[PDB]
Design a protein around this nucleic acid. Structure first.
Lengths: 100, 151, 75, 48, 48, 316
DNA sequence: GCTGGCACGACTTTTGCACTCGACTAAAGGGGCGCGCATGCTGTTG
DNA sequence: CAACAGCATGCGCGCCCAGGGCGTGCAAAAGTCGTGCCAGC
């Protein structure tokens, strides 16, 4: 189940054209798009297989996965992009020192 | 904390040599290009108005000096990292994004359909982000607090 | 009255993770102050007192809520 | 005039640690003043 | 019980007094990390 | 970095650290904890000195908060681990250390309160007239004074100075024919050559000052600056950093570059027979120095003999 | 009237300050491995 | 003779301790020894 995260988007209308997106966010944005009066906003996606180290490093929270493997790389993607952690998983909470 | 003021802004090797190179792929240059021309070696034609060398490109520095004498005109080339700062300073993501979109339509190769998307998702990240690209090569270097460097 | 097994107090409130919250919120009262035990003390620590009162059905989330509203209304 | 609390100044409750590039200006916002000399501690005085 | 300094003290003082309550804070070593990443030209700050 | 024993630290505890630890654990109010934290920093590695009281009170910036509040709190702080802590003047130190004798000590409680509370200023020399003041006689008072002399002073039990701060020497002076010969025992290369030249200047100092003679023959930095033609400040810096080592009287040699030192040796000789007169006579010694040709006239050369914790003046 | 401490003076000690590049001849190490990603040269499709 | 797709070589991840080991003038300013003056006993 955790290798099946990260789908790939065939069609437009949801922005995000032709690249690796969360399946969660895509199903949420398409759900909200079908909830809206416009049904063409939905797009077809294709799920991807990842492969468990790829799938760790690709986690939304830049704090985990930084501390998994590759720290230089991680922090450079994150510094240039300007991403926020949100603290939503268990390793982040540990490292900040808060409950899990 | 602390800080130290640098004469000639350099390095920040954290970017650039962490593959892939954001400075390389941001400016559409190979990392042997910019890596080669950071210190010493080429003069990295920057702006290059009224210059025989392409506004963007490199050249043999001895050949470039001979070329400038042959040209009879002076081209604002920068051999140090200031040309990457200048080039890097003159780069606009929105202008690059419009060029990239035209290039993606122009490209007939899927290989060319990947790189381009990398540059869209990168430069776009700098736009929505609000970081200036200039910042990558650094001028003021911050120094680490004393007690966590004990003696 | 040492408790080897909590199951009896877990049937009272599902998901032990809940039990631990309620147990300790009830035990805190007797521990720090401003409460006395609903059950005869067997010399045991306050934690076991609390789990016993949960196993007896005298204390639970709803009961502690009603006691909180009663103490806030009486004050 | 006193009742001086170092412990109480940071209770700071946050979410989402944020990250980005550091401009030379923001560097100088962190800066306590500049270190102009390489040497560390005088070997006589035993003071920095 | 490792790197929270104010919280280790409060902890032990409450234990001596029979409180058994935590008052958790933020562990040192995180603070350190934030300085060490600030030492490259990256800011990482904690946003509320 | 980590996974190794980098010299991260030890976090040892001094006396002020420990006193503050002791304050953390005692039933002080919000304010009283501020007065306590205000006093424990005032304390010194020596114990006794809590410095000025009224600056402790005034440091808080009025707004009420009388003297009595800092006084009580102060007493309780004075009562923490190392028995007598802080207080002031040593008198109250010995009264707090004497506060707990268990009260089952024979003859000691009363007598000790009289001697220690008041009149202790005259107990310095000996008993004498004090024996007539308290009406005590024989060994009754002497045993109490044995207890008072058995007390010790303040703290300096916490200490936390395991570091002796050794010398490590630098250059060894192998003693030759009633003198000294250098051997140097124990860019960066340029700095090493400069250190070797400093050792050579110390060897020149061997030629500059007689070893066998009392103290050291008077020399000027212009001699060492004459030999190798080096600047004065540079030579004084080499001798200031490194410390010369000799079999007898080894020293950084910074004081080695017979002047006042000979007078100090003469003062030491005068001190040996100076025991007979407590007041001492450096001015008379100065007259003797003038007769000897020194021409001292109640000068600081005599005053130095009359200073340096000499019996002179202090006995007077 | 004598001794001790301190103030004033002289001396003799302390301190200013740094650039070239200096270099210099070796000093050695040294039996995993996967995995992947990118750059580059080749090769075949029209 | 054109661009496009593939094969290959190189470089950087991992694992993991591992042990420590460490001169060259001259010149302006200041620290200190000497000498004298003033105050305490």
């Amino acid at each position: 189940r955790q290798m099946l995260r990260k789908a790939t988007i065939v069609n437009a209308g949801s922005s995000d054209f032709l690249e690796g997106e969360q399946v969660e966010y895509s199903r949420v944005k398409i759900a909200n798009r079908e909830l809206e009066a416009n049904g063409k906003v939905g797009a077809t996606y294709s799920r991807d297989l990842l492969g468990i180290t790829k799938a760790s490093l690709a986690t939304e929270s830049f704090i985990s996965a930084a501390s998994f493997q590759e720290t230089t790389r991680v922090l450079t993607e994150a510094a240039v992009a300007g991403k926020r952690d949100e603290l939503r998983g268990l390793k982040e909470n540990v490292i900040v020192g808060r409950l899990i | 904390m602390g800080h130290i003021e640098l004469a000639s802004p350099t390095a920040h090797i954290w970017f650039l040599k962490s593959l892939p190179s954001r400075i390389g792929l941001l400016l559409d240059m190979p990392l042997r290009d910019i890596e080669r021309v950071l210190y010493f070696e080429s003069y990295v034609v920057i702006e290059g108005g009224m210059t025989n060398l392409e506004r963007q490109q490199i050249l043999t520095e001895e050949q470039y000096l001979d070329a400038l004498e042959e040209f009879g005109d002076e081209f604002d080339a920068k051999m140090g990292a200031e040309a990457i700062q200048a080039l890097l300073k003159s780069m606009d993501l929105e202008q690059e994004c419009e060029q990239l979109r035209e290039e993606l339509n122009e490209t007939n190769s899927e290989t060319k359909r990947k790189k381009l998307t990398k540059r869209i998702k990168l430069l776009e990240a700098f736009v929505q982000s609000g970081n200036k690209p200039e910042w990558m090569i650094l001028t003021v270097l911050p120094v680490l607090p004393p007690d966590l460097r004990p003696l | 009255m040492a408790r080897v097994t909590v199951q009896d107090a877990v049937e009272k409130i599902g998901n032990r993770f809940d039990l631990v919250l309620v147990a300790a919120r009830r035990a805190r009262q007797m521990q720090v102050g401003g409460k006395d035990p609903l059950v005869p003390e067997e010399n045991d620590k306050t934690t076991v007192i609390a789990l016993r009162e949960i196993e007896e059905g005298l204390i639970n989330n709803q009961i502690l809520d009603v006691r909180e509203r009663q103490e806030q209304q009486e004050q | 005039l006193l009742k001086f609390l170092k412990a109480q100044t940071k209770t700071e409750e946050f979410d989402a640690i944020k990250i980005a590039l550091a401009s030379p200006d923001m560097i100088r916002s962190w800066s306590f003043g500049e270190v102009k000399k390489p040497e560390t501690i005088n070997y006589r005085t035993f003071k920095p | 019980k490792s790197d929270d300094v104010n919280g280790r003290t409060k902890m032990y003082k409450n234990i001596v007094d029979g409180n058994h309550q935590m008052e958790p804070g933020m562990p040192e070593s995180f603070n350190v990390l934030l300085k060490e990443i600030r030492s490259l030209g990256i800011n990482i700050e904690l946003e509320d | 970095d980590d996974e190794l024993p980098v010299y991260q630290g030890e976090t040892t505890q001094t006396l002020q650290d420990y006193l503050m630890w002791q304050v953390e654990l005692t039933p002080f109010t919000d304010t009283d904890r501020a007065i306590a934290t205000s006093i424990v920093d005032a304390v010194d590695d020596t114990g006794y000195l809590t410095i000025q009281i009224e600056d402790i009170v005034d440091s808080i910036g009025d707004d009420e908060i009388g003297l009595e509040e800092v006084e009580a709190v102060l007493k309780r702080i004075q009562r923490f681990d190392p028995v007598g802590v802080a207080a002031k003047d040593l008198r109250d130190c010995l009264l707090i250390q004497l506060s707990q004798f268990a009260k089952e000590t024979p003859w000691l409680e009363e007598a000790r309160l009289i001697i220690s509370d008041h009149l202790d200023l005259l107990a310095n020399h000996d008993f004498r007239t004090l024996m007539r003041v308290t009406r005590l006689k024989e060994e009754v008072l002497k045993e109490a004074v044995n207890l008072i002399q058995s007390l010790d002073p303040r703290p300096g039990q916490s200490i936390q100075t395991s570091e002796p701060e050794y010398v490590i020497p630098d250059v060894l002076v192998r003693k030759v024919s009633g003198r000294w010969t250098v051997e140097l025992n124990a860019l960066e290369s340029r700095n090493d050559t400069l250190l070797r030249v400093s050792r050579c200047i110390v060897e020149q100092q061997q030629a500059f000052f007689e070893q066998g003679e009392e103290y050291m023959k008077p020399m000027v930095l212009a001699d060492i600056a004459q030999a190798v033609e080096m600047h004065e400040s540079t030579i004084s810096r080499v001798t200031t950093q490194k410390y010369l080592h000799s079999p007898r009287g080894i020293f950084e040699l910074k004081y080695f570059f017979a002047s006042s030192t000979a007078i100090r040796a003469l003062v030491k000789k005068l001190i040996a027979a100076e025991n007979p007169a407590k007041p001492l006579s450096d001015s008379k010694l100065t007259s003797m120095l003038s007769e000897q040709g020194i021409m001292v006239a109640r000068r600081t050369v005599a005053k130095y003999r009359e200073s340096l914790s000499i019996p002179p003046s202090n006995q007077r």
